[PDB]
Amino acid sequence: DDEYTKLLHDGIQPVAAIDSNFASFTYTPRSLPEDDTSMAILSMLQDMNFINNYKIDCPTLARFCLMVKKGYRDPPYHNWMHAFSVSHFCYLLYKNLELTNYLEDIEIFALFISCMCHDLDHRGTNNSFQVASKSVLAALYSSEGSVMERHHFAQAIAILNTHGCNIFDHFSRKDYQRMLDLMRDIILATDLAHHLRIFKDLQKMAEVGYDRNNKQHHRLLLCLLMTSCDLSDQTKGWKTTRKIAELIYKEFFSQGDLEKAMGNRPMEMMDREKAYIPELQISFMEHIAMPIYKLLQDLFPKAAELYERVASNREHWTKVSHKFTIRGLPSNNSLDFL
Ligand SMILES: COc1ccc(OC2CN(c3ncnc4c3c(CC(C)C)nn4C)C2)cc1
Numbered sequence: 573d574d575e576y577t578k579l580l581h582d583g584i585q586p587v588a589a590i591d592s593n594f595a596s597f598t599y600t601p602r603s604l605p606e607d608d609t610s611m612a613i614l615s616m617l618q619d620m621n622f623i624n625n626y627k628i629d630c631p632t633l634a635r636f637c638l639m640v641k642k643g644y645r646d647p648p649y650h651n652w653m654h655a656f657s658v659s660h661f662c663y664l665l666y667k668n669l670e671l672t673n674y675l676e677d678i679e680i681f682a683l684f685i686s687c688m689c690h691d692l693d694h695r696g697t698n699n700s701f702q703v704a705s706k707s708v709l710a711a712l713y714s715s716e717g718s719v720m721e722r723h724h725f726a727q728a729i730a731i732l733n734t735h736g737c738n739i740f741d742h743f744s745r746k747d748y749q750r751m752l753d754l755m756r757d758i759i760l761a762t763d764l765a766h767h768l769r770i771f772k773d774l775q776k777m778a779e780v781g782y783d784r785n786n787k788q789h790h791r792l793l794l795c796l797l798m799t800s801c802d803l804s805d806q807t808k809g810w811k812t813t814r815k816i817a818e819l820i821y822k823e824f825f826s827q828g829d830l831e832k833a834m835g836n837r838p839m840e841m842m843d844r845e846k847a848y849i850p851e852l853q854i855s856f857m858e859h860i861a862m863p864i865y866k867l868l869q870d871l872f873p874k875a876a877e878l879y880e881r882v883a884s885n886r887e888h889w890t891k892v893s894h895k896f897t898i899r900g901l902p903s904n905n906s907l908d909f910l
């Protein structure tokens with residue numbers, strides 16, 4: 573409750589006072605100490621004018637932000653620092669790409685809130701694991717699909733329905749319904765299976781050109797932007813890409829270990845005895861990440877640098893690939909590992 577006191581009474585720090593490069597695509601939000609992230613969320617909301625536009629109650633917003641942060645567990649990748657960095661990228665898209673020409677204010681607001689909430693209570697395992705392990709989440713959502721994403725949305729709703737945390741309780745009934753419906757679609761769009769299903773519709777929209785008067789184009793654009801925020805760790809330098817691969821594979825291999833112990837054969841990328849990290853990262857960059865930022869570049873010319881950084885990071889994997897072969901003897905001069 574002392575974090576809350578300071579967050580409410582100390583005042584909202586200007587965005588520049590965090591870092592002079594905070595609003596740039598070159599900035600790495602993971603460099604920000606975890607203890608300064610809740611204040612950074614308030615600074616970003618204030619800078620986007622959401623607090624004033626929607627007359628958000630300060631005690632309510634302060635409680636909401638801390639409740640969202642508390643709602644994340646500590647697996648190697650799907651933790652609060654992932655949600656914070658994804659939310660930071662949404663802010664970057666707002667600051668650098670002129671979203672206001674494409675989306676409604678409420679849609680841009682829903683995107684940011686969804687970014688903060690999109691992986692709430694993640695346990696470090698994927699959708700297939702929920703079903704295979706017969707988890708409570710699969711009992712609740714397996715028949716509807718996107719098990720984890722349905723849970724993240726339900727966790728966001730449970731936070732909003734906690735006394736003193738409903739940042740939208742003063743909204744009109746229509747605006748309240750709209751907001752929760754947007755959060756549903758945006759959070760469900762974080763399932764990469766959903767992205768791969770709509771990819772041809774995203775290509776078609778970029779091809780014909782975005783139509784601001786087409787409601788389906790608004791829905792498709794919000795899906796693309798959310799996916800762009802979720803994979804944004806790949807738009808920085810090699811240092812971020814390398815570190816993120818360590819976190820992702822530590823999480824994946826922990827799942828694979830659980831599947832093996834259950835008598836199940838894990839997917840290749842989740843099996844520490846079979847996974848070849850450079851090949852898997854090249855495949856993910858080439859077939860998932862690069863086409864996303866290419867679509868983003870096609871719709872927004874100012875997003876060109878993002879695609880170029882992703883392409884550069886993909887090329888760095890090919891460059892370091894030879895290091896994954898043990899040439900000579902290991903550092904200890906022993907072949908005991910055999
Ligand atoms: C349905 O087809 C698929 C799904 C996943 C797949 O690649 C895995 C995802 N992996 C990633 N690798 C590096 N940076 C990543 C990710 C992700 C998503 C993960 C946290 C889940 N986000 N970021 C920033 C490697 C290949 C194909």
Ligand SMILES: [Mg+2]
Binds near residue numbers: 691720762
């Ligand atoms: Mg997710």
Ligand SMILES: [Zn+2]
Binds near residue numbers: 658691
């Ligand atoms: Zn995520």
